[model samples]
Target: MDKGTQYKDGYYITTLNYNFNTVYNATLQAIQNGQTFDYKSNPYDISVNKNNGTDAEIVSASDSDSTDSLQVAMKKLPNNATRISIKYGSQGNSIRSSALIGIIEGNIRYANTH
Candidate 1:
């Protein structure tokens, strides 16, 4: 029902095609739609919101596990979130990795479709 597209820089820009009620709701949905189970259906740690206690509007979803360097930062441009831009990456790792990119791409598509 929406459109999600990925770039070579590991940015999955998804257009929700509708406005959400709040930043928390939009970000929560992004986490749920972004982080999914592995190929074996093994569940991973849920991503945490990093915008707690901040006045900033931008929010980030990241894993709690230290080993999981994945980070997904989300923000709504122009002060409102009609377009959601998600950038996925890891510490000291390139987001351009084929496997990582593919996974993110899958998640983006899944979210857009659902």
Candidate 2:
């Protein structure tokens, strides 16, 4: 949703460092009540509220005791982008195994060099 910015002179561009974090239990549903569009390859827009479709799984679980990784990349860095950080809050089984699902928005941050 909200990128947290204000528009100036008909346009808004990012000009500073940033940090992002999201903490939640598994199985949080996405209540997309607005417009929905398909991704690059999907044929239809996954609109659960309107047509009974879902974009994300019911839950995400990480059983691995070790650190699991999620990937992120920005096509264009606005001005002086610097660093990024991420921390995942997950549920896991007793022993080490693959995570059930991985949420991308879990403690992701971006910073600027300047």
Candidate 3:
């Protein structure tokens, strides 16, 4: 039914059934744990601003150990669904960014549903 996670322009966007709090916290956990199927879990230092009406902003920590960087901003829709807008830094590494979004999406689903 859903179109699935989409990368349009510079943002990776998706809408989930969970509320803002449920999805937001899981997203934080997901990025930090980086639980993926095959590849090693490359954890990132992530934090959120927790802006309610406008947007909650999050950015991954950058260092020599992990050059990969990402930013996430989210909001709750009128119908109660939470929409995630993730900003990715790398353009050439398509698969990495793609998989990261999947990891975050998967975490939100796993946290709420059985």
Model 1 lDDT at residue 97: 29
Q: lDDT per residue, candidate 1, 1-114, as tens digits?
A: 434444544455554433333443544443456443344332333434455332213333334424333344444445344444444444322332234334544544555554
Model 3 over residues 14-72: C-alpha lDDT tens digits? 77666777666766666656553324444456644456664555776545325356677
Error of 3 at 59 (Å): 1.1
lDDT of 2 by residue, 5-82 (tens): 233332222211332112111112111211222232212222221111212122222233233322111222333221
How close is every model to the real structure, measured as TM-score? 0.38, 0.16, 0.65
lDDT (0 to 1) per candidate: 0.41, 0.21, 0.61
Give the winner by TM-score: 3
Candidate 3 yields a Cα-based lDDT of 0.61
Among all windows of 10 consecutive residues in model 2, the one with the lowest summed lDDT is 92-101
**Cα RMSD for candidate 2?**
17.1
Candidate whose lDDT is highest:
3
Distance from true position, residue 75, model 3, in Å?
A: 1.3
